[PDB]
PDB file of all heavy atoms in Angstrom:
ATOM      1  N   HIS A 110     -28.271 -45.134  21.496  1.00  0.00           N
ATOM      2  CA  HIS A 110     -28.358 -44.249  22.669  1.00  0.00           C
ATOM      3  C   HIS A 110     -28.304 -44.998  24.002  1.00  0.00           C
ATOM      4  O   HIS A 110     -29.234 -44.950  24.809  1.00  0.00           O
ATOM      5  CB  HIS A 110     -29.578 -43.324  22.574  1.00  0.00           C
ATOM      6  CG  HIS A 110     -29.480 -42.340  21.449  1.00  0.00           C
ATOM      7  ND1 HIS A 110     -30.079 -42.582  20.237  1.00  0.00           N
ATOM      8  CD2 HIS A 110     -28.818 -41.164  21.379  1.00  0.00           C
ATOM      9  CE1 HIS A 110     -29.784 -41.545  19.472  1.00  0.00           C
ATOM     10  NE2 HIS A 110     -29.041 -40.658  20.123  1.00  0.00           N
ATOM     11  N   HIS A 150     -26.020 -36.667  29.227  1.00  0.00           N
ATOM     12  CA  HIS A 150     -26.757 -36.060  28.112  1.00  0.00           C
ATOM     13  C   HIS A 150     -27.827 -36.923  27.438  1.00  0.00           C
ATOM     14  O   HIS A 150     -28.705 -36.338  26.804  1.00  0.00           O
ATOM     15  CB  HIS A 150     -25.832 -35.461  27.060  1.00  0.00           C
ATOM     16  CG  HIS A 150     -25.368 -36.436  26.030  1.00  0.00           C
ATOM     17  ND1 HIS A 150     -24.392 -37.370  26.317  1.00  0.00           N
ATOM     18  CD2 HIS A 150     -25.787 -36.609  24.757  1.00  0.00           C
ATOM     19  CE1 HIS A 150     -24.226 -38.075  25.208  1.00  0.00           C
ATOM     20  NE2 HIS A 150     -25.055 -37.664  24.244  1.00  0.00           N
ATOM     21  N   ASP A 151     -27.776 -38.261  27.564  1.00  0.00           N
ATOM     22  CA  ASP A 151     -28.785 -39.144  26.958  1.00  0.00           C
ATOM     23  C   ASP A 151     -29.456 -40.056  27.973  1.00  0.00           C
ATOM     24  O   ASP A 151     -30.059 -41.042  27.572  1.00  0.00           O
ATOM     25  CB  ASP A 151     -28.172 -39.976  25.799  1.00  0.00           C
ATOM     26  CG  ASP A 151     -28.213 -39.273  24.454  1.00  0.00           C
ATOM     27  OD1 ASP A 151     -29.161 -38.506  24.218  1.00  0.00           O
ATOM     28  OD2 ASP A 151     -27.302 -39.510  23.635  1.00  0.00           O
ATOM     29  N   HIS A 154     -32.718 -42.587  27.561  1.00  0.00           N
ATOM     30  CA  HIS A 154     -33.168 -42.493  26.171  1.00  0.00           C
ATOM     31  C   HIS A 154     -33.925 -43.811  25.817  1.00  0.00           C
ATOM     32  O   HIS A 154     -33.501 -44.901  26.214  1.00  0.00           O
ATOM     33  CB  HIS A 154     -31.956 -42.326  25.259  1.00  0.00           C
ATOM     34  CG  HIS A 154     -32.297 -41.797  23.902  1.00  0.00           C
ATOM     35  ND1 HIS A 154     -32.963 -42.575  22.972  1.00  0.00           N
ATOM     36  CD2 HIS A 154     -32.021 -40.594  23.355  1.00  0.00           C
ATOM     37  CE1 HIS A 154     -33.097 -41.808  21.902  1.00  0.00           C
ATOM     38  NE2 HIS A 154     -32.541 -40.609  22.091  1.00  0.00           N
ATOM     39  N   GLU A 181     -34.391 -34.218  25.791  1.00  0.00           N
ATOM     40  CA  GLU A 181     -33.311 -33.437  26.422  1.00  0.00           C
ATOM     41  C   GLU A 181     -33.703 -32.940  27.789  1.00  0.00           C
ATOM     42  O   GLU A 181     -32.920 -33.079  28.734  1.00  0.00           O
ATOM     43  CB  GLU A 181     -32.834 -32.308  25.487  1.00  0.00           C
ATOM     44  CG  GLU A 181     -32.199 -32.829  24.206  1.00  0.00           C
ATOM     45  CD  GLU A 181     -33.151 -33.357  23.142  1.00  0.00           C
ATOM     46  OE1 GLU A 181     -34.338 -32.957  23.134  1.00  0.00           O
ATOM     47  OE2 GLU A 181     -32.705 -34.174  22.306  1.00  0.00           O
ATOM     48  N   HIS A 184     -33.529 -36.008  29.984  1.00  0.00           N
ATOM     49  CA  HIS A 184     -32.149 -36.415  30.324  1.00  0.00           C
ATOM     50  C   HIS A 184     -31.620 -35.590  31.507  1.00  0.00           C
ATOM     51  O   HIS A 184     -31.012 -36.142  32.438  1.00  0.00           O
ATOM     52  CB  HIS A 184     -31.199 -36.306  29.106  1.00  0.00           C
ATOM     53  CG  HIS A 184     -31.658 -37.044  27.873  1.00  0.00           C
ATOM     54  ND1 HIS A 184     -32.199 -38.321  27.947  1.00  0.00           N
ATOM     55  CD2 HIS A 184     -31.622 -36.671  26.575  1.00  0.00           C
ATOM     56  CE1 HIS A 184     -32.482 -38.679  26.704  1.00  0.00           C
ATOM     57  NE2 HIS A 184     -32.162 -37.725  25.841  1.00  0.00           N
ATOM     58  N   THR A 222     -27.831 -30.540  23.051  1.00  0.00           N
ATOM     59  CA  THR A 222     -27.731 -31.807  22.316  1.00  0.00           C
ATOM     60  C   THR A 222     -28.924 -32.013  21.375  1.00  0.00           C
ATOM     61  O   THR A 222     -28.884 -32.938  20.569  1.00  0.00           O
ATOM     62  CB  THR A 222     -27.491 -32.990  23.238  1.00  0.00           C
ATOM     63  OG1 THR A 222     -28.641 -33.193  24.047  1.00  0.00           O
ATOM     64  CG2 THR A 222     -26.259 -32.830  24.106  1.00  0.00           C
ATOM     65  N   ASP A 262     -20.857 -35.164  21.047  1.00  0.00           N
ATOM     66  CA  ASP A 262     -21.981 -36.002  20.643  1.00  0.00           C
ATOM     67  C   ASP A 262     -21.768 -36.709  19.323  1.00  0.00           C
ATOM     68  O   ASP A 262     -22.156 -37.875  19.189  1.00  0.00           O
ATOM     69  CB  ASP A 262     -23.276 -35.183  20.593  1.00  0.00           C
ATOM     70  CG  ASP A 262     -24.519 -35.977  20.979  1.00  0.00           C
ATOM     71  OD1 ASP A 262     -24.385 -37.161  21.338  1.00  0.00           O
ATOM     72  OD2 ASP A 262     -25.613 -35.403  20.956  1.00  0.00           O
TER      73      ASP A 262
HETATM   74 MG1   MG B   2     -29.501 -37.049  22.726  1.00  0.00          MG
END
Side-chain angles (χ1 to χ4, degrees):
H110 294 97
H150 86 284
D151 273 328
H154 198 289
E181 296 76 24
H184 306 317
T222 67
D262 213 3

